[PDB]
């Protein structure tokens, strides 16, 4: 797509902790497989979108539990998921209070964040404290986007939830299909005609080591069991002390970003194109791969759009998944 | 899609069909090549009504020179409205394609429950009381008394329709019941009598069965209309049951006591009107002697009650005997009432043929045959004469008089069976009298005589060959329709094997066997744990559903079924069933699992059509077997052995399978739907019973699925739903 | 439930829950071909429960 995307993205993951998480349709029980692919999900999402954040709610025993708050580093989330392997999964799940707390925070937030909730939802019987239909009308009117990945069944309710919060509903066959769905929700989803297009004020703090062998330095502890920090990253708005640069300013409200962070997600904006895939021999006067200078010992030849060079299957998967650019069009 | 159907272009309505639609053309290619009835079977996948109308319009467009009027006949009132609006969609498509000039008077028609306006008749809830108050507010004589006075009661609707409304035909507008009521509100009319007056000008009329097959209602489509008419029945499994409901008559001791009170009331009315007037009684004696009771019959719109229940070809044209003086006719009804009351006194079950009952009459209370034929004409003329107002009060005696007509008309095909007691009637005298019929053919007989080409469509392809034999019927076409699919869309399994390897059956004849009910509950539990979007569970009889859900409670099963889904058990109240259905459809919308368990005979599975997501797994409990059969069944089976040639064990299996596959055969409402339809007992695997399910369900009944266990069936359900919940887009069907 | 059906009434009953649809059900007060629907007799113990 050549469309607007939601690139600052407070996503918020709601997992079941239902009775139906303990069912053994997957190769381990659904809790374990779901939690493993969420570990992979947090990894690839922080690997691809650096500005954004994640928060994890386990929904358990008709109540909702904010298990890990909305933050932007994978250590705390994956540590909490390694903890949450050990849980119990008892009682029916309430999708009311958790969506209420997520709405309550995601109603007054800066209008440019595409505020997104991902409900990995398994069971069928849901207890509703208010009216479910009025909750969807409210959540339709409340600026947020909710997408539900479903297990074992499809409720016209998850379809209404997905198409109204503006999300997408999906049901799971396999391990591989479920990986494809979470990979589909890694990428920044396109924006509606409703979300604010603001201009967030940003800060770009340089790294600062101990000035000149600590000749008149500023010895601090940290800012969020810490040692004595000699130098590091400042915050020019408030001039505080941060160890890791990609941290929302804890005492100002500025967002702090290093030079790579914006460049780590530039491929979404000038994206790739399609490779013309042709299996047969077909006029190939360029026998060797323009990717890595190797012969084409298979019947799959892939030719770009602009330069129209030659690529094999290995160069296809590598260019379209990782390098994100054609090597020909750079030249 | 622009079909050539051998004479005409046909614009497929929306533009989506399976290759079976091309096969569909071939099936009716035989049907209209030669005119002569014809029985079709398109399953519930294709537009049932849409399919039954595209090709008939293609033939009438290619060569529309021998068809005046379509009379569609669907039973339930929502279907009447649904078929009219699909016809209206097809005309809107037809006029999008062409231009503006599309003359076409579509028209529904039901009754005074559903086309009456008047705010004092409208709050009545029952049909006979609405008919009684409509007989009060308009008549042949109350209308005249209002015509030469001012303050006498009138509707203002029928009077204004009488003023101007019988000269303007309804211009080309397809009308529902609601649209027709609105037009009755608008200019100020009766849309009931507007609809009946505008039968003559229509092109498609959509009313119910009992408005065509009853001889005592259907006196409104004449011979000259019928010689070029195409009648299309729809959902026509129980045509024979409609006929036997349409000519049998039940008499009860309460009916005869209220008949005695009616007789005393009418005696007092004859006395006081003898004190009042004499001249119209002279005119009565004239029009009995001179004519054949047709003097004031020309202006007869709301003076018509239910007519004579003899058929259209067995009525007479003579003079009614010794009956003429109304005092002597009250003596005549007095004699007949006391003899039928004495005959009902017998405290054992007595079967007779109607000539034996006529001979018992003509010997022991001196009533002969021809004055017993003319009793219906006499009571209708008398009850028109004495100006009496609320005819609901006179419902029993008319019944008795109409019963007299049948006893004096038909023989060798019908049967008078007397029961001193029934089933559910402990410590209560309830002697009833079935004049029951068992010729199915004697009610559709004038439907094949008058009409050009009648066709019946069933979404379930019930074993058909038998129907022609029953109905005295010889068709042109016996065309079978096959479900052509790009996706399996359904799987039937025959779970006839318990998890303990107990043979699941209902051989015990409703006297409970414990382990079989245990395996039924285990099936329902594990199928609850697999299936989403609800589960429909049809049992055999309400005594058997009663007993089963009883012993699912003392045995510890039903709380687990509660843990998986929400039950909605059925009852034989008219309002409690509707509330249980409404909560069953609200629970699916809530998303919490629901499960409706009902009986495979009642109204729960007649009107209802499988929802895309309202029933995913139609659980047919048992084989439609009853345990309260007196002797109407034995006598209809003795008849089908004797004068038709259809066996005992053939007709029982046919009837059971048409009910079972009726309640489980409308699942594919839209080709793109997935529907689990389980049959739960071992008898559906036994070759003759499986052999009489339709072809579009036997095609997908695999030998591995034949006699599954509970848990094997649950795993087949899981694999079914998982393979059939994926994106099956339009591009997988072209 | 019996107060909602007998004493108390509903609320959402206009085009939805139409009175005419309710009128169609329950047949007629006078004797009918299959009147035997609600029996004033035959009240047992287990069946009532
Ligand atoms: S005459 Fe018309 S308005 Fe009056 S009761 Fe009959 S149908 Fe209703
Ligand atoms: Zn700051
Ligand atoms: Zn290129
Ligand atoms: Zn290569």
The per-residue b/e assignment along B300-313, b for 16 or more CB within 10 angstroms, e otherwise, is ebbbebbbbbbbbe
Contact B117, C17 (CB under 8 A): no
Residue A14, CB-side half-sphere exposure with 13 Å CA sphere: 28
Contact B286, B324 (CB under 8 A): no
Nearest chain A residue to B612 by CA distance is A156
DSSP assignment letter at B119? T
- What subunits touch chain A, counting only 3 or more CB pairs under 8 A? B
Contact B457, B56 (CB under 8 A): no
CA distances for B118 relative to B134, B136, B137, B180, B189, angstroms? 9, 12, 10, 14, 10
The CATH fold of domain B490-725: Rossmann fold (3.40.50)
φ, ψ for residue B243, nearest 5 deg? -65, -45
Chains C and A touch (3+ CB pairs under 8 A): no
User: How many residues are listed for chain A in this entry?
Assistant: 331
Supply the Cα-derived Rg of chain A in whole angstroms: 23
Residue B500, CB-side half-sphere exposure with 13 Å CA sphere: 10
Nearest chain B residue to C37 by CA distance is B572
**Who contacts B19 (Cβ-Cβ below 8 Å, separation ≥6)?**
B484
Residues 391-410 of B with CB under 8 A from C: 392, 395-396, 399
Residue ID of nearest Cα to ligand 1 atom 6:
B134
Place of tokens 């074992």: A152
Output the CA A240–ligand 2 centroid distance in Å.
6
Quick one: angle between helices A97-105 and A132-141, nearest 10? 10
Contact A239, A254 (CB under 8 A): no
E strand intervals along B527-653: 536-539, 566-569, 594-599, 617-621
Cα–Cα distance, B542 to B570 (Å, whole number): 9
**Who contacts B156 (Cβ-Cβ below 8 Å, separation ≥6)?**
B188
Supply the Cα-derived Rg of chain C in whole angstroms: 15
> CA B345: distance to chain centroid?
33
Q: Bridge-partner residues for B2, per DSSP? A: B11
Output the CA A255–ligand 2 centroid distance in Å.
8
**Strand, coil or helix: what is B473?**
coil
The per-residue b/e assignment along A64-90, b for 16 or more CB within 10 angstroms, e otherwise, is beebbebebebeebbeebeebeeeebe
Residues 204-223 of A with CB under 8 A from B: none
Closest CB from B532, B589, B590 relative to A152? B532
Question: What atom of ligand 1 comes closest to residue B115's alpha carbon?
Answer: 7
CA torsion, ordered B439, B444, B445, B446, to nearest 10 deg = 150
- Resolution, rounded to a tenth of an Å? 3.9
Ligand closest to CA A307: 3
Closest CB from B114, B125, B422 relative to C26? B125
Structure tokens at A107: 């109603």
Cα–Cα distance, B37 to B477 (Å, whole number): 8
DSSP assignment letter at B43? -
Measuring CA to CA, which residue among A121, A129, A118, A247 is closest to residue A185?
A118
Q: How many CB atoms lie within 10 A of CB A99?
A: 27
Contact B557, B519 (CB under 8 A): no
Cα–Cα distance, B598 to B601 (Å, whole number): 9
DSSP assignment letter at A92? P
Residue B319, CB-side half-sphere exposure with 13 Å CA sphere: 11
**Strand, coil or helix: what is B714?**
helix
Measuring CA to CA, which residue among A120, A127, A91 is closest to residue B566?
A127
Contact A21, A89 (CB under 8 A): yes
A163: closest CA of chain B, how far (Å): 16
Report chain breaks in chain A, C–N > 2.5 Å, as residues after which they occur.
224
Contact B39, B506 (CB under 8 A): no
Question: What atom of ligand 1 comes closest to residue B134's alpha carbon?
Answer: 5
Closest CB from B77, B425, B579 relative to C24? B77
Q: How many CB atoms lie within 10 A of CB B709?
A: 22
Cα–Cα distance, B456 to B454 (Å, whole number): 7
Cα–Cα distance, B630 to B250 (Å, whole number): 14
DSSP assignment letter at B501? S
Cα–Cα distance, B232 to B197 (Å, whole number): 22
DSSP assignment letter at B192? H
Structure tokens at B508: 């015990």
A125: closest CA of chain B, how far (Å): 4
Q: What's the longest Cα–Cα distance across chain B?
A: 85
φ, ψ for residue A80, nearest 5 deg? -70, -30
Contact A297, A34 (CB under 8 A): no
Torsional sign, CA B18, B20, B23, B24: negative
Relative to beta strand B490-494, strand B478-480 is: unpaired
Best probe of the B interface among C21, C26, C31, C48, by most B CBs < 10 A, is C31
> CA B569: distance to chain centroid?
25
Burial of A272 (0-12, 13-18, 19+ CB in 10 A): middle
Measuring CA to CA, which residue among B609, B612, B623, B577 is closest to residue B596?
B577
Output the CA B128–ligand 1 centroid distance in Å.
13
- What subunits touch chain C, counting only 3 or more CB pairs under 8 A? B
Quick one: angle between helices A30-48 and A175-184, nearest 10? 30
Output the CA A322–ligand 4 centroid distance in Å.
14
List, as one string, the DSSP characters of B273-311. Answer: HHHH--HHHHHHHHHHHSSSS-SS-SS-SSS--S--SS-
Which strand ranges, in their side-by-side order, compose the sheet holding B566-569? Answer: B490-494, B675-680, B617-621, B536-539, B594-599, B566-569
Does the distance separating the beta carbons of A132 and B533 come in below 8 Å? no
Contact B215, B307 (CB under 8 A): yes
Does the distance separating the beta carbons of B425 and C30 come in below 8 Å? no
């Amino acid at each position: 797509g050549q469309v607007r995307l939601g690139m600052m993205r407070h996503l918020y993951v709601v997992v079941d902790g239902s009775r139906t998480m303990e069912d053994q349709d997957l190769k381990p029980n659904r809790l374990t497989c779901t939690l493993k692919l969420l570990e992979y999900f947090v990894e690839e999402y922080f690997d691809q979108n650096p500005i954004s954040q994640i928060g994890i709610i386990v929904t358990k025993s008709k109540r909702a539990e904010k298990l890990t708050e909305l933050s932007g580093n994978p250590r705390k989330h994956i540590t909490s998921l390694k903890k949450a392997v050990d849980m119990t999964c008892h009682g029916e799940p309430s999708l009311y209070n958790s969506l209420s707390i997520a709405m309550q925070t995601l109603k007054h937030m800066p209008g440019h964040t595409s505020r997104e909730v991902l409900i990995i939802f398994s069971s069928l019987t849901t207890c509703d404290p208010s009216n479910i239909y009025d909750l969807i009308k409210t959540l339709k009117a409340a600026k947020i986007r909710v997408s539900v990945i479903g297990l074992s069944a499809e409720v016209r309710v998850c379809t209404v939830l997905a198409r109204e919060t503006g999300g997408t509903y999906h049901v799971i066959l396999d391990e591989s299909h479920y990986k494809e769905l979470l990979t589909h929700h890694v990428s920044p989803p396109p924006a509606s005609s409703s979300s604010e297009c603001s201009l967030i004020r940003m800060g770009f703090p340089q790294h600062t080591i101990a000035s000149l062998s600590d000749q008149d330095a500023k010895p601090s502890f940290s800012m969020a069991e810490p040692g004595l920090t000699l130098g590091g990253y400042f915050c020019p708005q408030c001039r505080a002390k941060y160890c890791e640069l990609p941290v929302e300013c804890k005492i100002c409200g500025l967002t702090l970003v290093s030079a790579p962070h914006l460049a780590r997600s530039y491929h979404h904006l000038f994206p790739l194109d399609a490779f013309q895939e042709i299996p047969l021999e077909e006029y190939n006067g360029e026998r060797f791969c323009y990717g890595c200078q190797g012969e084409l010992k298979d019947q799959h030849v892939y030719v770009c759009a602009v330069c129209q060079n030659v690529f094999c299957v290995d160069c296809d998967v590598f260019v379209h998944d990782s390098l994100h650019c054609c090597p020909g069009c750079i030249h | 899609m622009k079909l050539n159907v051998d004479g005409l272009l046909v614009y497929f309505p929306y533009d989506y069909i399976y290759p079976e639609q091309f096969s569909y053309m071939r099936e009716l290619k035989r049907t209209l090549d030669a005119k002569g009835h014809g029985v079709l079977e398109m399953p519930s996948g294709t537009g049932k009504t849409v399919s039954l109308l595209a090709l008939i319009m293609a033939y009438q467009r290619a060569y529309p020179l021998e068809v005046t009027k379509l009379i569609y006949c669907s039973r339930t009132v929502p279907e009447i409205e649904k078929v009219i609006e699909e016809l209206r969609k097809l005309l809107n498509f037809y006029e999008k394609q062409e231009g503006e000039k599309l003359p076409f008077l579509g028209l529904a028609l039901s009754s005074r429950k559903n086309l009456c306006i008047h705010p004092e008749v409208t709050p009545l809830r029952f049909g006979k009381d609405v008919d009684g108050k409509c007989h009060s507010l308009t008549a042949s004589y109350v209308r005249a008394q209002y015509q030469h006075d001012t303050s006498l009661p009138h509707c203002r609707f029928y009077e204004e329709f009488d003023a101007h409304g019988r000269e303007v035909p309804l211009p080309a507008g397809i009308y529902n019941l609601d649209d027709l009521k609105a037009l009755g509100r608008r200019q100020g009319w009766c849309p009931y009598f507007l609809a009946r007056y505008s039968i003559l000008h229509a092109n498609v009329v959509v009313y119910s069965y009992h408005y065509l097959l009853d001889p005592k209602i259907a006196d409104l489509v004449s011979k000259e209309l019928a010689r070029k008419a195409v009648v299309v029945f729809d959902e026509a499994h129980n045509i024979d049951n409609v006929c036997i409901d349409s000519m049998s008559v039940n008499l009860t001791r309460r009916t005869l006591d209220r008949c005695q009170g009616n007789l005393e009331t009418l005696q007092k009315t004859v006395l006081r009107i003898k004190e009042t007037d004499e001249q119209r009684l002279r005119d009565e004696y004239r029009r009995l002697v001179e004519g054949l009771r047709e003097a004031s019959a020309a202006r007869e719109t709301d003076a018509h009650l239910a007519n004579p229940v003899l058929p259209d070809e067995v009525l007479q044209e003579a003079v009614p005997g010794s009956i003429r003086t109304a005092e002597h006719f009250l003596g005549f009804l007095r004699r007949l009432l006391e003899y039928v009351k004495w005959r009902l006194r017998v405290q054992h079950v007595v079967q007779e043929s109607p000539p034996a009952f006529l001979s018992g009459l003509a010997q022991r209370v001196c009533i002969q045959r021809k004055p017993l034929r003319f009793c219906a004409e006499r009571l209708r003329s008398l009850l028109h004469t004495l100006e009496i107002t609320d005819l609901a009060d006179f419902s029993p005696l008319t019944l008795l008089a109409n019963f007299a007509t049948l006893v004096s008309t038909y023989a060798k095909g019908f049967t008078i069976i007397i029961e001193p007691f029934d089933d559910r009637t402990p410590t209560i005298a309830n002697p009833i009298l079935h004049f029951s019929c068992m010729d199915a053919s004697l009610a559709i007989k004038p439907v094949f005589e008058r009409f050009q080409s009648v066709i019946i469509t069933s979404g379930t392809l019930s074993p058909l060959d038998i129907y022609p034999k029953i109905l005295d019927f010889h068709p042109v076409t016996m065309a079978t329709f096959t479900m052509t699919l790009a996706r399996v869309c359904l799987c039937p399994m025959i779970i006839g094997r318990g998890n303990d390897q107990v043979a699941i059956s209902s051989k015990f004849e409703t006297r409970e066997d414990i382990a079989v009910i245990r395996n039924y509950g285990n099936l329902l539990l594990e199928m609850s744990a697999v299936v989403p979007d609800g589960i429909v569970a049809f049992f055999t009889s309400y005594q058997y559903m009663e007993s089963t859900v009883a012993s699912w409670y003392e045995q510890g099963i039903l709380e687990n079924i509660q843990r998986n889904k929400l039950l909605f058990i059925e009852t034989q109240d008219g309002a409690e069933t509707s509330v249980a259905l409404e909560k069953y459809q609200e629970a699916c919308e809530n998303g919490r699992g629901a499960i409706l368990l009902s009986v495979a005979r009642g109204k729960v599975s007649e009107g209802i059509d499988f929802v895309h997501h309202y029933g995913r797994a139609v659980i047919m409990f048992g084989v439609p077997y009853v345990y309260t059969q007196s002797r109407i069944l034995k006598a209809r089976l003795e008849y089908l052995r004797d004068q038709f040639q259809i066996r005992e064990n053939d007709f029982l299996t046919f009837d059971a399978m048409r009910h079972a596959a009726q309640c489980v055969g409308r699942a594919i409402r839209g080709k793109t739907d997935y529907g689990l339809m389980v049959f739960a007992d071992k008898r559906f695997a036994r070759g003759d019973k499986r052999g009489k399910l339709p072809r579009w369900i036997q095609e997908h009944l695999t030998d591995a699925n034949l006699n599954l266990t509970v848990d094997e069936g649950v795993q087949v359900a899981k694999y079914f739903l998982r393979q059939m919940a994926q994106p099956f887009h339009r591009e997988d069907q072209l | 439930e019996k107060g909602l059906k007998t004493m108390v009434s509903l609320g959402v009953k206009n085009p939805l829950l139409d009175l005419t649809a309710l009128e169609d059900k329950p047949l007629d007060e006078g004797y009918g071909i299959s009147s035997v629907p609600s029996a004033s007799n035959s009240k047992s113990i287990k069946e009532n429960s």
